[PDB]
Design a binder for this molecule. Structure first.
Ligand SMILES: CSC[C@H]1O[C@@H](n2cnc3c(N)ncnc32)[C@H](O)[C@@H]1O
Ligand SMILES: CSC[C@H]1O[C@@H](n2cnc3c(N)ncnc32)[C@H](O)[C@@H]1O
Lengths: 248, 247
């Protein structure tokens, strides 16, 4: 039996198009996490609805590893823009993802108040063990061949640009524009709740991973959430997965 | 014969537990090591989770799939948020929650950044049960498990054992004003894994309790003392043995 491609999305709107594309489906739920097992172009594919945020993403990914032993993972869905060059509908291919919500601060007394510009990325949250030995990570690189394939397919996407970028994952939805700008300037983020958590689990299991995110919103351009972007992202991802399958 | 699962993030938070197990067998999958043995003749699995919300959720989910535990004790060290508490005191989690989850309202760049305006973003704790959405603003420690730990308070001789609210985040805060604000806003006793492990335990409907020793608190100038992690494990061993006596 052939090891499946695992394709993830957090919300119903981010998976319904993927699920509709599968043939010969069955649906499995364990705990809080649902999976649809079927085929695309005759090849096994599992679609996972992860639910939202880092804990949910890590659980859903781990459970998929244990149940399905996928050959690669595509985490996809929507995101908010951090780079002013990007607009709603543009797709970011994650050259890296990282836990943007991880914060450590030096000691300051009460009289100095609160200063988030002094909250630094706390890399221990991405530290893993490999065969028992500690391995530091400041980010997780998208598998570079998977990243490159998606960039090479850019002109197959009908609804915006496809760009490489850094995906900042956090249990956050930021709409303070000064904070978005600070995160972009500090971490070079393209967009901002699951990617790096799923990536962390994929790294632990040594399974190739790529994050593919459409901007559904950006407060840098007054562009409010458009759910149709989620459908467009899934269409691109289906094309992308079919191209991988043709190569298997 | 379903085991008790006992978790800690760091080596210092599990090696005392591991030393207590009889007939140990070790298993490593991905980044996560488990020791399967017995305490008082009953199956116990000790899990070294690694640090933070993603690691805790992965390690807990992996344990659910591999071992099907009957209850989960998540333990380790924490930082004080309540000025009444000192290094060495143990907090039993009446509830835990994702303190690091934030949503903010739209503000233009001219208005700057104001974390006091950020709201707790509860969607990060939302689950599905038989496919249907279930909101959570926190995860209650199993109240019988909580009560048992409080009832055993006088068996711990290195501080007080108190009920409190555990704030989980991928954060180590040392801005005292931020600690104070979080305490005032969320009533936290202490502050990187508990609510994430608790979320997975809720999804699998397995009783859960968080037990955290304060290894540090910047509210009293008390810096990290690793011996607190050993003392916490000693208490947890006693606690697990009491549960086992009752099985
Ligand atoms: C309902 S919570 C938001 C969901 O959509 C994603 N998302 C879309 N836009 C944003 C944004 N601006 N900030 C954070 N998460 C976002 C998140 O990864 C999560 O799964
Ligand atoms: C090495 S990162 C800190 C580890 O110890 C815990 N911890 C101890 N003290 C604190 C603290 N003040 N703030 C956040 N996490 C703490 C965390 O849950 C994590 O596993």
């Amino acid at each position: 039996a052939s090891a499946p491609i695992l394709i993830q999305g957090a919300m119903d709107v981010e998976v319904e198009t993927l699920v509709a594309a599968l043939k010969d489906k069955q649906e499995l739920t364990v705990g809080s996490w649902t999976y649809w097992q079927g085929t695309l172009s005759g090849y096994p594919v599992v679609v996972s609805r992860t639910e939202v945020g880092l804990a949910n993403a890590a659980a859903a990914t781990t459970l998929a590893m244990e149940r399905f032993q996928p050959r690669l993972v595509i985490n996809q869905g929507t995101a908010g823009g951090h780079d002013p060059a990007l607009h709603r509908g543009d797709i970011v291919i994650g050259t890296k993802s990282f836990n943007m919500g991880a914060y450590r601060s030096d000691l300051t007394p009460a009289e100095q108040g609160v200063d988030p510009s002094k909250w630094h990325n706390f890399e221990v949250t991405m530290r893993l063990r490999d065969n028992g030995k500690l391995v530091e990570h400041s980010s997780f690189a998208g598998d570079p061949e998977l990243v490159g394939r998606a960039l090479g397919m850019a002109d197959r996407y009908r609804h915006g640009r496809v760009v490489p970028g850094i995906i900042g994952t956090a249990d956050e939805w930021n709409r303070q524009v000064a904070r978005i700008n600070w995160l972009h300037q500090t971490y070079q983020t393209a967009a901002e709740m699951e990617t790096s958590s799923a990536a962390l689990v994929a790294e632990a299991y040594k399974v190739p991973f790529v994050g593919i995110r459409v901007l559904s919103n950006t407060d840098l351009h007054g562009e409010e959430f458009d759910p149709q972007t989620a459908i467009h992202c899934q269409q691109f991802v289906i094309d992308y997965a079919k191209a991988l399958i043709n190569g298997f």
